[PDB]
Ligand binder design. Structure first.
Ligand code: HEM
Ligand code: HEM
Ligand SMILES: CC(C)(C)OC(=O)N[C@@H](CSC[C@@H](Nc1ccccc1)C(=O)NCc1cccnc1)Cc1c[nH]c2ccccc12
Ligand SMILES: CC(C)(C)OC(=O)N[C@@H](CSC[C@@H](Nc1ccccc1)C(=O)NCc1cccnc1)Cc1c[nH]c2ccccc12
Lengths: 452, 452
């Protein structure tokens, strides 16, 4: 099984029996992809256990996988388990059941439904400022992921179920616990990659990478909410759709996906931004000046004034370049195909190393340096959309891209209208990324906060 | 494998392929043991999957297993897994490592160390009264397991680490969460009994019936406490012992056992008592009168005045007869032996059905009726210590029996000095026991509480 890439003429590191190349994940996926990109070039291979993985870095070949041949060949991602009833979640579902779900859930994320969400997402930005001010009037540094997490949590439960909580002042509420509760290099998932034949063992055991309790809490919580608005957010838009149509437990599963999607991602991207803003204080001033020009007297951001801000889009995009939280994009090749002159055998995982491509000196000058001007309208043209892909690409890209950018930008506008963020003695500079299996900081980001 | 009891001449229900007799657990262990005791007699057999289990009800034969041949033959209980680092917990450990631990932990539970604990256990009884009074001055019924659990939780963290919390008013404290977080007939453990060859699968996966997070919280919490009192309760008595000696992670493991031991047990026995007191109001008055005679002016109970109360011991004992939380006692037979004229082959689990023996009409008149006078000093003599065994018997019996009886009695004395407990319209009468795999009520116990 370990002779595949040795046959196809594709180069790669020598796999060990059973382990494959996974000992090379000791420095984390990011550092391993970079070294492979360096040693090997435009295409290489390795083995997650006995699983072949082909990394590709040609943007034409990437467009073929993510777009051109998405429906025919590269339709699903690597099988993930054990998942239990979470098999019906859009990001996990496969082939025609993914296609059905993606459609039933697509109108949820239009710019029209997104503009209805602005006045609601704009209300918890104010709850955020007062929690910062209480820690700004105090003095003690601030841990961003705490305060940003509490905010991102407040946007989720409101934009997805209607529930309204100040989590930072209500850590022991009715749903704030369950909803705060996957390291792909921890003892568990490495044991998967080596023993992926033990996934089916756990699926007959009802054991789940989603704890059987959080899921049990929201499965019944939804069916209370469902039989409450009926008759008298995401949950509403999904229930209206099933009026081939969406099921009840299918509806719970997409809710659970939308929560992790907008909790740790939204709150962890904001912390990469605030770290970079705090360590590049001119970019902070330029941003503060642009907000006050569009929104004078700290005017409330509207859906339209947010898209009006260009230097804010440049800042977000550049932070997503340095910290693309997905790290890699992946598609399971389901047929023997020949894309851009290369034969891909059936069953091979095709992987795009986003992190490595975002930091490639062949496409980016000074790629470690935080330089937002790359995304100025003068230079935004010269950027290859299949090299910089923080939301993936093609029919299977991030369905909540628009919502995530709008959610994070409404947060930043209000927060930078009232605060400046300074490095602390305890602030990790330069921020070390987690040697583990997540795109997260080694030490969490602590910063000083001052009231304008 | 299913031909064993068919060969030995022992009667039993016909086992199905792979499942054995476990479909017969549908009404719970209790009802199944009673029916088997009824249909079959003094000795019978069944199969937990391919595991042979021999039930015995002769008190001479039981004394042989629990006492006479405990060290030689019947030393450990049924293998339990997956357990991870919790293998070193006294109740799980085996043979010489159990013997070493039982010794290193025995002086902890002397009546001398227990008398030092009284003034501390007496302090949270007052915290209990004021939480009841707030729900007694209000009116709304009271769920006993909530308020009793909060109390039992407060005694644990104090008598085992020194930490002091009012959990009922601090549900979101630093340790109250972790510490509040096994149904042997849920989807998981039935899958064990049928696939017990999958336990070793999980032990190479670090997966644990103890969540990897609660254990991680207390493993480090202990090693903070350890290097804090050093230098400047159970944890202290264990640390003094290791001065063949107790280890560090061994010390964490016994702490985790002492917590579940005194949290759900203590708080669930108190609720069986309060249910029975509320549904037999004369027994409540007789008890209230005896406390006021020993402790006039609601005098504070002392270690000695608690043992002075006889009708209180009768009440506890009779409640433990009707609801012996263990349900069964068990020992793995490690040699071919012939005890009381019966050949026991190696590897067979020997089981004593406590619940069924506590309700046997051959030893108890009106065994369902709650009749505390069975344990009056006139009739306490005529009770067979190998028929009524709420704490087991012999070298492997409950190490915290004395502590549990003292802990529960200090609770009852203070609570009955200030409250009467009435049935509510919502009170489940007659209380149905959980059809599941726990000795717990179907519906939780709700009762009215009135201030004396
Ligand atoms: C900064 C925020 C976010 C980033 C950078 C991000 C990034 C990504 C990426 C890279 C993918 C895979 C794309 C591919 O394979 O081509 C993805 C998929 C997905 N995202 Fe996001 N995401 C973010 C937030 C969100 C939010 C707020 C939601 C809310 C619903 C969401 C919902 C989803 C779903 C459902 C998928 C799977 C789509 C499918 O398989 O059909 N994401 N995201
Ligand atoms: C009403 C309260 C309790 C009851 C009815 C009870 C009952 C039992 C029973 C039946 C056993 C098995 C005995 C045997 O196999 O012969 C046992 C064992 C045990 N109990 Fe308790 N228990 C109670 C509370 C506690 C408490 C508060 C502790 C605190 C440390 C504790 C610690 C233990 C330990 C460590 C074992 C295992 C002993 C060994 O395997 O060496 N128990 N209990
Ligand atoms: C297994 C691997 C790495 C080879 O393959 C994956 O990718 N398995 C995905 C696992 S199940 C999809 C789901 N995970 C999740 C995680 C924790 C709790 C609940 C759900 C998901 O979508 N959460 C929202 C999200 C996260 C990040 C960006 N946006 C949206 C993990 C995954 C990471 N980023 C993805 C992007 C699209 C689809 C899946 C993923
Ligand atoms: C597996 C079976 C049923 C065939 O065999 C058992 O019995 N496996 C015992 C499991 S591991 C011992 C440990 N469980 C535990 C449970 C949850 C969290 C943490 C620990 C334990 O001791 N908790 C204290 C206790 C509970 C009840 C009375 N007193 C003390 C389950 C068990 C039930 N009652 C016992 C009495 C003695 C020893 C073990 C048990």
């Amino acid at each position: 099984s370990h002779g595949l890439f040795k046959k196809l003429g594709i180069p790669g590191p020598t796999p060990l029996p059973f382990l494959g190349n996974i000992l090379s994940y000791h420095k984390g996926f990011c550092m391993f992809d970079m070294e492979c990109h360096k040693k090997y070039g435009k295409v290489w291979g390795f083995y997650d256990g006995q699983q072949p993985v082909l990394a590709i870095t040609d943007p034409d070949m990437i467009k073929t996988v993510l777009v051109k041949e998405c429906y025919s060949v590269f339709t699903n991602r690597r099988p993930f388990g054990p998942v239990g009833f979470m098999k019906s979640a859009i990001s996990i579902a496969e082939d025609e059941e993914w296609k059905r779900l993606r459609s039933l859930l697509s109108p949820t994320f239009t710019s029209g439904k997104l503009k209805e969400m602005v006045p609601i997402i704009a209300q918890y930005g104010d709850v955020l400022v007062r929690n910062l001010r209480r820690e700004a009037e105090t003095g003690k540094p601030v841990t961003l992921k705490d305060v940003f997490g509490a905010y991102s949590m407040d946007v989720i439960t409101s934009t997805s179920f209607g529930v309204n909580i100040d989590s930072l002042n209500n850590p022991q509420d009715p749903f704030v616990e369950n909803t705060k509760k996957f390291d792909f290099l921890d003892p568990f998932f490495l044991s998967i990659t080596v023993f992926p034949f033990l996934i089916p063992i756990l699926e007959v055991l009802n054991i789940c990478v989603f704890p059987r309790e959080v899921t049990n809490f929201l499965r019944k919580s939804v069916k209370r909410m469902k039989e409450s608005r009926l008759e008298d957010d995401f949950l509403q838009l999904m229930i209206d759709s099933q009026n081939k149509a969406l099921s009840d437990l299918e509806l719970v599963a997409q809710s659970i996906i939308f929560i992790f999607a907008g909790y740790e991602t939204t709150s962890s991207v904001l912390s990469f931004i605030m770290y970079e803003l705090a360590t590049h204080p001119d970019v902070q001033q330029k941003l503060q000046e642009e907000i006050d020009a569009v929104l004078p007297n700290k005017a409330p951001p509207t859906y339209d004034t947010v898209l009006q801000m260009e230097y804010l889009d440049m800042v977000v995009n550049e932070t997503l370049r340095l910290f693309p939280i997905a790290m890699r994009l992946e598609r399971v090749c389901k047929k023997d195909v020949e894309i851009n002159g290369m034969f891909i055998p059936k069953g091979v995982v095709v992987m795009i190393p986003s992190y490595a491509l975002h930091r490639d000196p062949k496409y980016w000058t000074e790629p470690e340096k935080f330089l937002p001007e790359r995304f100025s309208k003068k230079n935004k043209d010269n950027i290859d959309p299949y090299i910089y892909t923080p939301f993936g690409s093609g029919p299977r890209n991030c369905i909540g891209m628009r919502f995530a950018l709008m959610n994070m930008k409404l947060a930043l506008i209000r927060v930078l209208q009232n605060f400046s963020f300074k490095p602390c003695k305890e602030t990790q500079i330069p921020l070390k990324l987690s040697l583990g299996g997540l795109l997260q900081p080694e030490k969490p980001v602590v910063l000083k906060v001052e009231s304008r």
